[PDB]
Amino acid sequence: AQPKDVPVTFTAITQGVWMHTSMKHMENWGHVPSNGLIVEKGDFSILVDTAWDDPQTAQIIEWSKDTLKKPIRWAVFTHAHDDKMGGVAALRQQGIVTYAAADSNRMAPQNGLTPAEHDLIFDSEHSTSVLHPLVIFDPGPGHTRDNIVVGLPEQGIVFGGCLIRPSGSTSLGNTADADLAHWKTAVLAVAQRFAEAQQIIPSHGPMAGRELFELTAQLAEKASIP
Amino acid sequence: AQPKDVPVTFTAITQGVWMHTSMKHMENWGHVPSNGLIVEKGDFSILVDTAWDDPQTAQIIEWSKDTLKKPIRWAVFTHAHDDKMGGVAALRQQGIVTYAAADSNRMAPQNGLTPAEHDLIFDSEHSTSVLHPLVIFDPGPGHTRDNIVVGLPEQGIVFGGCLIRPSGSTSLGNTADADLAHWKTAVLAVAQRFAEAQQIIPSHGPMAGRELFELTAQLAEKASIP
Ligand SMILES: [Zn+2]
Ligand SMILES: [Zn+2]
């Protein structure tokens, strides 16, 4: 009735784009969800963000092989916290090619996380098509110093990660590692880079629209003012 | 897929004893569970603790009338927090007779809660059988200054509320209103008053055995020492 460990759920977002949601068990026996993406690419698939730990990330790998029939071959992570890089070791064990921002790979050891194998190389416009059709974009410090976002401009989807706050949020959440001064600038930079995308996916809760940009911008503006 | 509001669940514990579990939606779109009891008494039933809010408590009232066919006529609450008295108003609108510790009723309007209608009157041994076969026991301050417990000695069940920590806990949880000095004494007083009960129900997570007494006593002992 009250299970400690719940299996990772997979939901179709659009054609060729799946959202994976995993739950972390808390001491009060509640759960906190985290979203990631699986993006089809020919006969294989790209993973955006891991689950909370190795065995939950192992579920995503197995689901991509057994159900999707498109095994994950590449993975990218949006920042160096355990809801995004918690299961990096399980990917590198399976031979997945893993990418992260150079800053995310440097601070992963301190946060008790396995680093990604490759540093992303951004161009002068702070983008990289190394995982096309994903556009990996670096908007600057916000939720963390190292957070990056992933856009799917062909399908009108932005995965904002923790940089974008869940719908209904009245606070910025965990602000221990945040850059309150720059958070609004980073949110607006994402909205301007993917000006057409109508489907915005935060790290927690349901996918929504561009109002998530307004919500996070205003919550960050209010927090930036002493 | 990810619902904001999940319905209250009801679980048979033993014959004539049900456990209700309700979830509070959080800003990270996680959920926090809370347990209470419904105890059959002839053609009606006794409610131990509300849900988080009025509509979730309204589900319990309606489930007791439609599914159990034993409408709730009495209610008792273990302390004046929102996961125990969050729906007292819905019980009072239905004419249900409500009880709580005197201190819980003094403390409720200050914490944004509706007080219970009657103050419990305890005997020299800090018990009352006003809601027999329930034994309502006052063990002294612990999680809060006012927390009380409910025992079903005929069935070997103790409902510890927040006074008992969930299984797997490594901390005392929300310690803002706690009595760290007396918490262990209150836990041991409950374990002594109901020496034979083998089914211990905390406020969060699954029912377990008397090792919950050991866990909370040792966590409170560790925290009481400067
Ligand atoms: Zn984070
Ligand atoms: Zn409480």
Write structural notes for this entry.
Two copies of one chain form a homodimer. Chain A is of the alpha/beta class and 226 residues long. The first copy, chain A, has one domain: Metallo-beta-lactamase, Chain A (4-Layer Sandwich). The first copy, chain A, contains six helices and twelve strands. In chain A, the strands form two sheets. In chain A, strands 1-2-3-4-5-6-7 form a seven-stranded mixed β-sheet. In chain A, helix 5 packs antiparallel against helix 6 (211-224). Chain A is globular, with a radius of gyration of 16 Å. Chain A binds chain B through residues 1-2, 9, 11, 21, 23, 26-33, 166, 168-171, 173, 204-206, and chain B through 1-2, 9, 11, 21, 23, 26-33, 166, 168-171, 173, 204-206. The structure holds zinc ion (ZN) (2 copies). One zinc ion binds next to loops of chain B. Chains A, B: One of its GO terms (molecular function) is metal ion binding.
Summarize this entry quickly.
With about 230 residues, chain A is of the alpha/beta class. In chain A, α5 packs antiparallel against α6. The longest helix of chain A has 14 residues.
